[PDB]
C-alpha cells in the first residue's frame, strides 16, 4: 500500500498536534509522523514549535534521534 | 513443571558432526538422582540447565 | 448372530485321592443342546497338570495327566 | 574408631557413635575415587590425624610375619594397624592382649573349595528380597589382611555394620608347594617359591582368634593330571606370546585399543543420540588384526588341560 | 508373587559366578525382584515381592537372565531391562543347509571369520549383537535388525564368501 | 558509583534466573560507564560471559554487512535506545534489558541426528551461555526487521522491541522465534 | 456370566502362542484344551502381509485377547509357546516372544510358561534342496 502524507498541517491535524501530541511521555519526529500521517520534516519542526511554546521538555538531541517528554 | 540442573561432569561430546555434548547432571532440588543429558552449545563444569523433561530414557532409535 | 459363552457352563476339575490339592481349575462346557448331551461332551479330556499344583511340598518338572 | 580407606570406599558415613576417630594422613590421599574426596570435603571435621611410633611399628610387624600376613598387607596398611595400637595402650586394657596366638587345626573336608560357601544369592530359601543388599575404641576395616592381625590380638572392631566382629569368612592361598599361605586373593602365583602351586583355602576367624582353617581334603584339587606338556620355543620379539610362566617375566606390550577395550555404560541416559545400541566392533586397528584379547577373556581355555581333545579348526590367542 | 525359573548349563555356570554382581544388581534394585540360583537344581529363579513396581519388570528380567545363558555379554544383555523391543532369535546352523563332517566346521568359520572379524562386523552393521555356539546361533536386536541379521549370516552359510556378504548387507542397510 | 552513560545504576538490576545470573553481566564490578570497553573477550573459550552485555548488544548490533565495524555508531543507538525505555517504562532499563534478555532465549531446541538425506531432529538440551547467545542475536535481528524500510528509527525500534520481550508478548520478534525454536522441539522431544 | 470364584483364587486358562515365519498366532483355550475361548491371529490386525509376523502384530492380537480373556474372568493363563518345528525351524521366534511380553501387562497372571514345539527325534526329508534355502 501507498502512503502518502501531508506536508503541511490541516485544521484538524494542527489540533491533534496542539492537543493530544504533548500528552504522550515519549515524542519523537519517527512517532509523530506514524500516529498523526505527516512527513518527517513537518513534524520534526513542529516539535520545535512545541519547545518554542514551551509545553514538551527535552532528553535528548542528536543528529539522527530527538527525543521529546510531556510536560513534566 | 520446569526443573533446573547442576553440571556435574562434562563427558564427552555426541551428535552427527560434533555438536552436542554430553554431561553429568545434578539435579537442584538436591535429589542424589542424576538424571545425565545432552545439550547444544557450549557447557563448562558447574553449569545450570533448565529442562522441560526429565523423563528423558536410555533408549535408541 | 449367536453369542455362544451364554450357551456354556462351568465346570470344576477335581483330582483324585493321591494329591493334596484336587480343585484344580475350571473347563467350559456347551449344555445340551437338546441332542448332545453335555456331560458327553466332557467325557474325554486330559489335563496337563505340574506336580506342585497337586502337592505342596513338591518340584515341578514332572506332570501328570488325567481323565474327566 | 580407626577409619580406612575400605570403609570411605564403601562410604561408611559412621562419625557418630564411636567418637575416637584416628586416620591416618596418607590412606585416605591414596584413594583415587572422587566420592571419597566428596567425603573428605565435609564430614571428616569428627577425626583426628595421628601418626604411630617407631617402637610400636615394629611390635606389630613381628606377629605379622607369625600370623603370616606381612606380604599380604600394604605399606599404608601396616600403619594402621599400629594406629590401633597407641589407641589400645591409651584406652583399653592391655592385660586383655595375646600374640603368637594358635595352631593351624586343619578341619578337612569332604567339601570342593570352589563350592559356594556363603554367596549370597547361591543357595544348595536364602533369597535376597530387595533390602538385604545392605545387609550383606576399635577399627572399620573391610581388608581381611587387615582384619585377621586385630582378631589375633583379641582386639574386638566394628565395620559398616554397627555392631562388633565376631565371625570372619573368608579365603586366603596357601602354596600346595612351600606352605606358605598369603591373605591375597587376586595373585594366582606364589610369593615364597613362585610357582602356580597356590590354591585355595577357607578360614574361619573368631574375636579371640581361633584359627581353624578348612583345608580342602579333596582329590579333584590334590591332582597331577593336566600338569605336564611341551612347551614352545622360547620366543624374543615385539609380537612373541610365551605361556606365562613366572609372575614377572617381560612380556612385550601388547594392549587394547581404547575404542576396543570400553565397553558400554548403558546405565547412563544421556545415550540416545547417534549410534547404534550396542558398542561398536573394532575391526580397524592392528590390534584386532593380531587377535590381542583381554587377559580375564578365555580364562576357561586357560583350565583346560592342553592335552586333550580340541576341536580340530580352534587356536587359541 | 509370581516368579520365573530359567536353567544353567555347566560351561554357563561360571560365567554365572564370575557376574554375581552385575547380573544382581539391576534385577534386586532397578525392578524390584527376587534372585537365587537353585544349587539343587541349578536354575536361575526371580520373583516378584511387594516392592515390584511394574507388571511387566518381571518379564523382561526373564529375557535379561535368558541372553546371558544363551552366551551374550553381561552389558549388551542389560538393555533388554531398558529398551522396549531387542529381541532374540536363535537357529540351528543346519536349518538352512545340510552341513556335516568339516563343511559344518567351516560354516563356523566362515560365520566366524579370522580373528572374529566376520562376526565383528555384521553386529556393527545390522544394529545387533549375535553369539555362537557350535550348532547354535544366537542373534540380538531389533527385529529388522534382527532379519537383516539372519540373511548376512544365512549366506555366509551356504556358500557365499564374507566379500559378496559385506556387499550384499550395505544394500539393505540403505533403507 | 559507577553508572552506565553517567545516569544509569547497576544495584537496582536484579537477575531472576539462577541459570542465567552467573551468564550475565553487570552487576556489581562489572560495572562500568560505557559499553566500549575494547577487550580481549575472545581470546580463548567462556571469556564473553565476563564481560558487559550491554557491550554484549552493541556487538551484536554492528553486525549487518554496511555497519560492520562502527562501534561508535552502534554505542549511539544504544544510548538513545535506553532513554526511549525510561521514557516509555520509568524502569530502569538495564532491568528492562535483563527482562527482555530471560525471555527471549529458548530452552529446548532441536538437532539433526541420521545420516544424510534423513531429516529426523531430535530436542536437546539449551546451554546456559547459548542461550544468551540466542537471545541477544534474537534482540538484535528484530530491530533490524520492522526498521529496515520505515520511518522509525533503529534507535527506537531497539527499545519497542526490547520493551517487548521483558512483557514476554507476542508483539515482539525474538518472543516469537523462542515460540517456534521450543515449539518445534517438543514436537521432536 | 462365568466362573464365580473368590479374588484371591486365580482362574486359570491355557494361551497357546504359535509362531511361524508368516504371522503368529495367539491362542486362549480351556486348561484341556479342547475348547479355546478366543483366538486372535496375528495377521488379523495389520493389513499389509509385509508386516504379517511383525512383534508390533503380535502385541495388537495379545491385547485383543487378553481383552476377551478378562472379559470372560480368565484371570490367569499358562502359556505353551510353540514354533513351528518338525522339518523346520525348532526355536519360537521374537514374534512368539512379543506376544508372550504384550499380555503379561496387559493384568494376567502369567504361571507355567510352556515349550511345545513339534520336534522328532528323526524326520523325514528337510523341505530344502541339498543346495540350501534362505533363512
Ligand atoms: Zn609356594
Redesign the pocket.
Given at each position: 500500500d501507498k502512503l502518502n502524507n501531508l506536508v503541511l498541517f490541516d485544521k484538524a491535524t494542527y489540533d491533534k498536534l496542539c492537543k493530544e501530541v504533548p500528552n504522550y511521555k515519549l515524542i519523537t519526529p519517527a512517532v509523530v509522523s506514524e500516529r498523526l500521517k505527516i512527513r518527517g520534516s513537518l513534524a520534526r519542526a513542529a516539535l520545535q514549535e512545541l519547545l518554542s511554546k514551551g509545553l514538551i521538555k527535552l532528553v535528548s538531541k542528536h543528529r539522527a534521534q530527538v527525543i521529546y517528554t510531556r510536560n513534566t | 513443571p520446569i526443573k533446573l540442573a547442576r553440571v556435574t561432569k562434562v563427558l564427552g561430546r555426541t551428535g552427527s558432526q560434533g555438536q552436542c555434548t554430553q554431561v553429568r547432571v545434578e539435579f537442584m532440588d538436591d535429589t542424589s538422582r542424576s538424571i545425565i543429558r545432552n545439550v547444544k552449545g557450549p557447557v563448562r563444569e558447574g553449569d545450570v540447565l533448565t529442562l522441560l523433561e526429565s523423563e528423558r530414557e536410555a533408549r535408541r532409535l | 448372530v449367536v453369542d455362544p459363552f451364554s450357551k456354556k457352563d462351568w465346570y470344576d476339575v477335581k483330582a483324585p485321592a493321591m494329591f493334596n490339592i484336587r480343585n484344580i481349575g475350571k473347563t467350559l462346557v456347551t449344555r445340551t443342546q437338546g441332542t448332545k448331551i453335555a456331560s458327553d461332551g466332557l467325557k474325554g479330556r486330559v489335563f496337563e497338570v505340574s506336580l506342585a499344583d497337586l502337592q505342596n511340598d513338591e518340584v515341578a518338572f514332572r506332570k501328570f495327566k488325567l481323565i474327566t | 574408631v580407626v577409619a580406612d580407606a575400605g570403609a570411605f570406599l564403601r562410604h561408611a558415613a559412621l562419625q557418630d557413635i564411636g567418637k575416637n576417630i584416628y586416620t591416618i594422613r596418607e590412606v585416605v590421599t591414596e584413594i583415587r575415587d572422587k566420592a571419597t574426596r566428596r567425603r573428605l570435603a565435609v564430614l571428616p571435621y569428627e577425626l583426628r590425624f595421628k601418626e604411630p611410633l617407631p617402637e610400636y611399628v615394629r611390635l606389630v610387624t613381628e606377629f605379622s610375619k607369625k600370623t603370616g600376613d606381612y606380604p599380604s598387607l600394604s605399606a599404608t596398611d601396616i600403619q594402621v594397624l599400629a594406629l590401633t595400637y597407641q589407641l589400645e595402650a591409651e584406652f583399653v586394657g592391655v592385660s586383655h592382649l595375646k600374640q603368637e596366638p594358635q595352631k593351624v587345626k586343619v578341619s578337612s573336608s569332604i567339601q570342593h573349595p570352589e563350592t559356594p560357601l556363603h554367596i549370597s544369592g547361591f543357595h544348595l530359601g536364602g533369597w535376597i528380597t530387595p533390602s538385604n543388599i545392605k545387609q550383606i575404641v576399635g577399627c572399620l576395616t573391610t581388608d581381611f589382611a587387615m582384619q585377621n592381625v586385630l582378631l589375633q590380638m583379641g582386639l574386638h572392631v566394628l565395620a559398616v555394620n554397627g555392631m562388633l566382629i565376631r565371625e570372619a569368612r573368608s579365603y586366603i592361598l596357601?602354596?600346595?608347594?612351600?606352605?606358605?599361605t598369603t591373605s591375597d586373593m587376586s595373585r594366582v602365583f606364589?610369593?615364597?617359591?613362585?610357582?602356580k602351586?597356590?590354591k585355595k583355602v577357607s578360614v574361619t576367624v573368631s574375636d579371640d582368634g581361633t584359627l581353624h582353617m578348612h583345608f580342602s581334603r579333596n582329590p579333584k584339587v590334590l591332582n597331577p593330571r593336566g600338569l605336564r606338556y611341551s612347551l614352545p620355543t622360547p620366543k624374543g620379539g615385539k609380537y612373541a606370546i610365551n605361556p606365562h610362566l613366572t609372575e614377572d617375566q617381560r612380556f612385550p606390550q601388547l594392549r587394547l585399543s581404547q575404542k576396543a577395550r570400553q565397553k558400554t555404560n548403558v546405565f547412563a541416559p544421556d545415550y540416545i543420540a547417534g549410534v547404534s545400541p550396542f558398542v561398536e566392533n573394532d575391526i580397524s586397528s592392528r590390534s584386532a588384526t593380531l587377535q590381542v584379547r583381554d587377559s580375564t577373556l578365555g580364562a576357561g581355555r586357560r583350565r583346560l588341560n592342553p592335552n586333550a581333545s580340541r576341536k580340530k579348526f580352534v587356536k587359541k590367542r | 508373587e509370581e516368579t520365573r525359573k530359567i536353567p544353567v548349563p555347566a560351561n554357563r555356570y561360571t560365567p554365572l559366578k564370575e557376574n554375581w554382581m552385575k547380573i544382581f544388581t539391576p534385577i534386586v534394585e532397578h525392578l524390584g525382584l527376587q534372585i537365587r540360583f537353585n544349587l539343587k537344581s541349578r536354575n536361575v529363579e526371580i520373583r516378584t515381592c511387594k516392592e515390584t513396581k511394574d507388571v511387566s519388570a518381571l518379564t523382561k528380567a526373564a529375557d535379561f537372565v535368558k541372553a546371558f545363558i544363551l552366551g551374550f555379554q553381561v552389558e549388551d544383555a542389560l538393555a533388554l531391562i531398558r529398551l522396549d523391543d531387542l529381541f532374540l532369535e536363535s537357529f540351528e546352523i543346519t536349518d538352512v543347509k545340510p552341513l556335516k563332517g568339516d563343511h559344518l566346521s567351516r560354516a563356523i568359520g566362515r560365520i566366524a571369520g579370522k580373528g572374529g572379524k566376520t562376526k565383528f562386523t555384521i553386529e556393527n552393521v545390522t544394529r545387533t549383537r549375535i553369539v555362537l555356539a557350535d550348532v547354535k546361533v544366537h542373534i540380538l536386536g531389533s527385529f529388522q535388525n534382527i532379519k537383516m541379521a539372519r540373511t548376512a549370516i544365512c549366506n555366509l552359510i551356504l556358500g557365499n564368501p564374507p566379500s559378496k556378504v559385506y556387499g550384499n548387507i550395505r544394500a539393505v542397510a540403505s533403507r | 558509583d559507577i553508572k552506565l552513560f553517567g545516569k544509569w545504576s547497576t544495584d537496582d538490576v536484579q537477575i531472576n534466573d539462577i541459570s542465567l545470573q552467573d551468564y550475565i553481566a553487570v552487576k556489581e564490578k562489572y560495572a562500568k560507564y560505557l559499553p566500549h570497553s575494547a577487550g580481549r573477550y575472545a581470546a580463548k573459550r567462556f571469556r564473553k560471559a565476563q564481560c558487559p552485555i550491554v557491550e554484549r548488544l552493541t556487538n551484536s548490533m554492528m553486525m549487518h554487512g554496511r555497519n560492520n565495524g562502527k562501534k561508535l555508531m552502534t554505542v549511539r543507538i544504544v544510548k538513545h535506545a535506553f532513554e526511549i525505555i525510561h521514557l516509555l517504562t520509568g524502569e530502569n532499563p538495564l532491568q528492562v534489558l535483563v527482562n527482555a534478555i530471560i525471555n527471549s532465549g529458548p530452552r529446548e531446541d532441536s538437532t539433526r541426528i541420521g545420516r544424510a538425506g534423513t531429516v529426523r531432529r531430535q530436542a536437546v538440551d539449551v546451554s546456559p551461555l547459548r542461550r544468551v547467545n540466542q537471545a541477544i542475536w534474537l534482540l538484535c535481528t528484530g530491530a533490524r526487521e520492522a526498521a529496515f524500510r520505515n520511518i522509525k528509527t533503529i534507535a527506537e525500534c531497539l527499545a519497542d522491541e526490547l520493551i517487548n520481550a521483558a512483557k514476554g508478548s507476542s508483539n515482539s520478534y525474538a518472543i516469537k522465534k523462542k515460540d517456534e525454536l521450543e515449539r518445534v522441539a517438543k514436537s521432536n522431544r | 456370566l462365568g466362573p464365580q470364584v473368590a479374588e484371591g483364587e486365580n482362574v486359570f486358562g491355557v494361551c497357546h502362542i504359535f509362531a511361524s515365519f508368516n504371522d503368529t498366532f495367539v491362542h486362549v483355550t480351556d486348561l484341556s484344551g479342547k475348547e479355546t475361548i478366543c483366538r486372535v491371529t496375528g495377521g488379523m490386525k495389520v493389513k499389509a502381509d509385509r508386516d504379517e509376523s511383525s512383534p508390533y502384530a503380535a502385541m495388537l492380537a495379545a491385547q485383543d485377547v487378553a481383552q476377551r480373556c478378562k472379559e470372560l474372568g480368565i484371570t490367569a493363563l499358562h502359556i505353551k509357546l510353540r514354533a513351528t518345528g518338525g522339518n523346520r525351524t525348532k526355536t519360537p521366534g521374537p514374534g512368539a516372544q512379543s506376544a508372550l511380553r504384550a499380555l503379561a501387562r496387559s493384568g494376567m497372571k502369567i504361571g507355567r510358561i510352556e515349550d511345545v514345539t513339534p520336534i522328532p527325534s528323526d524326520s523325514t526329508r528337510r523341505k530344502g534342496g541339498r543346495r540350501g534355502r534362505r533363512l
Open positions: - | - | - | 596357601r602354596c600346595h608347594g612351600c606352605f606358605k606364589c610369593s615364597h617359591c613362585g610357582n602351586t597356590l | - | - | -
